[PDB]
Amino acid sequence: VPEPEVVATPPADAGRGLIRVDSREIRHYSGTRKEPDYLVSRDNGKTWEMKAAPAGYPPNYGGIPKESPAIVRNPLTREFIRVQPIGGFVFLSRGGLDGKWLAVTNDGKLEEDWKDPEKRKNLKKLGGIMRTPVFVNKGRRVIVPFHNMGGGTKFHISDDGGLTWHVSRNGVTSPRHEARPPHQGVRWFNNAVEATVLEMKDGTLWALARTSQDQAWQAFSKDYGETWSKPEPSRFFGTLTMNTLGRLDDGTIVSLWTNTMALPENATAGNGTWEDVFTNRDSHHIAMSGDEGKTWYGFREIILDEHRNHPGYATLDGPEDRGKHQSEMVQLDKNRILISLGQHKNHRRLVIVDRRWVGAKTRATQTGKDLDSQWTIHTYIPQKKGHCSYNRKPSAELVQDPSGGTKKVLQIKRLDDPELVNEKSNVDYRNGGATWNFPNGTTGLVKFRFRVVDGEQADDSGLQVSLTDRLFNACDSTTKDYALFTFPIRLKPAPHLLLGMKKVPFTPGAWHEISLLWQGGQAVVSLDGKKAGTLKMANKSPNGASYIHFISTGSQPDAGILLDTVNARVK
């Protein structure tokens, strides 16, 4: 099955501006303040180059330099509508993207002479931070989600193709974060911002929005966006990152988001007006549904941020927002989807995924071979740098397999590194760890191979092993508290698994395999091919397991454990 393939870097942060022109040409526009331009592919997304837009295409009067306007085709007229992420005007095409453009006036007319600054004074200016215009109701209505950070999302609505506009009666909201353990402070408050909208087969609109909770929240409309239900938690985990919904030609729904859990808030997190530090923006994920959202599959990592481990992460090539959050998609053919994702010129990417890979039931890995592409291992230097960022270090390193040969394996231990401690913000990220994604399953079997390091160990040394439903940081010791299933490997007095109350001893200084076969609310744990015990599920999930998470447990520097292979198969 074809793995995700990076094909280009878009010329703006992802989420707006990616637009199919025809069966072979796709463009990604930009937020340039100069003469407008775009990145273009003429081979259906495989190769790309920059090009200047023609003279009839309007400059970015609104928007910001790092984000393109959203550009959307009207399915009835086959023309395009363009709005900015913020500010500026509503432009409609006549003759396509390379034809004439007209700006919408306050009185519902079209202005051809928008190069005249006097004539721009009477142009319609839609308010708020906007996302993507979406045509609904057999193309007869267009709605544009917009938000205020603390006020919530509402919708700009037009019933005449964008000539005249009204605002929905209500929209989407979500509650403030409540500081309770393990948090020592409050998350940045976003009130159901950055909504994405999908029309369902029964005509309902589903709005999915970014929140300060552990998951995105959602609401529904029965009147094409004029009024919306009470909001509620969605099944898509994630916090303060963006969701995008789409639909393939065959009706399959695609959900793109950053399926992560941030680190608990620290003791200097601020009052929640703005963010203190981002600890959850280094991946992007995909899931699909063939039955109108009744069931979902996939929950696969599209990509991990290539810079995630590095001690200069926060400031390399300018401090602007960075990572793998935000996305937009264009279907390429029956199997392939093009995704623009991420923020910052060193991080944002155009990636081709294959739905057959989304639907796969197995995955395997070896830490020595696959660390850079597949393994989340970063810890943080807890000193805020750049714009709401931390620099990182790898929390674990590859070492020679003590059995000999050429294998390299991952040493997971409690680190002797004072730089990973901030006493004022009261955080200590010295426990090394590692986490790895696999296709989601409510029933599955995961096997991993590990070895106790021949070295000094602390009284509490070992490894907490968890199955989770989103990506928890490698250094997050609270993962077990949210996990679907979790148990410790304890090294002292002698090595053993603790499965409920049962202790299962095993030898140090030798490779061993542990299997977890989970189904419903129970997991059976095996050691070297022999049933060892069972685990009761610690937390229910709306989706199932899609990560295994390993973190050291020692509270003083130790030698820890080595991790070799992991494989997973789901039902």
Added chain:
Amino acid sequence: VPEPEVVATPPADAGRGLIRVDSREIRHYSGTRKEPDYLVSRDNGKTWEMKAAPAGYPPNYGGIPKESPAIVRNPLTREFIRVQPIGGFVFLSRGGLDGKWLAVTNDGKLEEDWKDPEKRKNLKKLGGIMRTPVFVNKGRRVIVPFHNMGGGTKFHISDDGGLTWHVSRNGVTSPRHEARPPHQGVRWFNNAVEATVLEMKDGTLWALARTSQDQAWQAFSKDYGETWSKPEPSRFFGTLTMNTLGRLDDGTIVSLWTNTMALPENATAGNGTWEDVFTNRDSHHIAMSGDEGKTWYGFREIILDEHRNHPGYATLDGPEDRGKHQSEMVQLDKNRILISLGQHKNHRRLVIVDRRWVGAKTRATQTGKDLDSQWTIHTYIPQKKGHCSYNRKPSAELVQDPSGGTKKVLQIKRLDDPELVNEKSNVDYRNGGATWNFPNGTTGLVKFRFRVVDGEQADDSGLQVSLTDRLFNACDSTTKDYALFTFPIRLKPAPHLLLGMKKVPFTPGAWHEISLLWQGGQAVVSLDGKKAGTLKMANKSPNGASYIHFISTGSQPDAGILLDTVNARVKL
């Protein structure tokens, strides 16, 4: 970055008398024949009011009512020297402008009792028409340029702070103007007069002087003013108007002048002893150099004369010399410069400019909005009035955009106005036109939008479009002969551009955009975004292009063309 800002009217014509007192106080003295006075700002140039000078400050024994004495601070003693534009005495201060003043005697002493008429008979009297004392050679020498109208510039030199004086061996001269076409007569002869002097980094002195040629002329001294090189044309275009050079705190050189070309001389211009009529004094310009004059930028219009279009220009509130020629400068801070400029109470101004505006690389305009501030459009009623002046009319007028809406656009046509003709002096200023400044560039891109008026046209109707290196009058049909690049838009037999030998048709009844992209000795011309042709440079420039000039070409009354926007970008 602010555009130039008028802040006051000085109490004398510009060029002498503007003097910084301290970090916040600046004064402009006057030529009053009564008790001396000055205009003063106590907020570093922003606001101004008149004040009487204190009792120790001498009256203007020399000079003339419309000009202040020059006042200059000695950088070593921190005291001041004062000389008149003509006549009078040499005064030195002891205790500053509001302290004691002493007059220099013929025998190199200082007279304290200059209020006594008897004692004034033995005071030193420097001859000629004098400009500004300048201290050179680490402040150890002071020199004062002086001239005779037909004899040339020389320098009064003192090596003891103004106590004793000698004259330079030579100075600056410049040739008489020659009456060759398009002239029908000779320009007023001035022999390198009104010099301004700047000390260069290497100790050379540069003198820049007003002439009867198309540009100021210059000469150089290697001995702090005793002897001067042969004279030569300078890079600063202009005729029979004043130059001023100065240097900012950071070493940047500033050149202020009137960057214009006068109309060709007419058939009754006289023998050149004195002027017949001034046709080039309605603007002032600035340029700067950070590399001791090797490279210059700016060439921007500081201001246009607000009265320039009017049919009573020559006589309003008295006929004395008027316009925007003559200037003097005082730096205000790192970015801003105060300039006194012009002549006549209704015309002379104190203006603050910003060096970041001087260094800008773009400008844009729309005729209907910007005509009064930015567009030179005047034609002349060719009847001499007042003192060497013509009354004017606007040669082009704003009309409704035919596309509809509130936009106004400028109609440029051959006028039916016999008042614009003088058959004895043989001039006919009935071709309307318009010209607009932009920052200098040896490379650049200028775009303008035009449309043919729906009306009857003559066989030669159209618009001659020129890029120039100084301001040519709106009604000057010879501009094309001096232009860096030029070409005609012709309306008959059908509308077309003529680019060399290539005819490029365009439609009537619609707006069109022409682009001119120049580099070196060629300009690429585009029409509505499509390359149309090329133009070879018609005349080289020492500086580059800083004006676009549009003039009607019809020789009988016609409907002409409309002009909407122009924009410019240089240093590509």
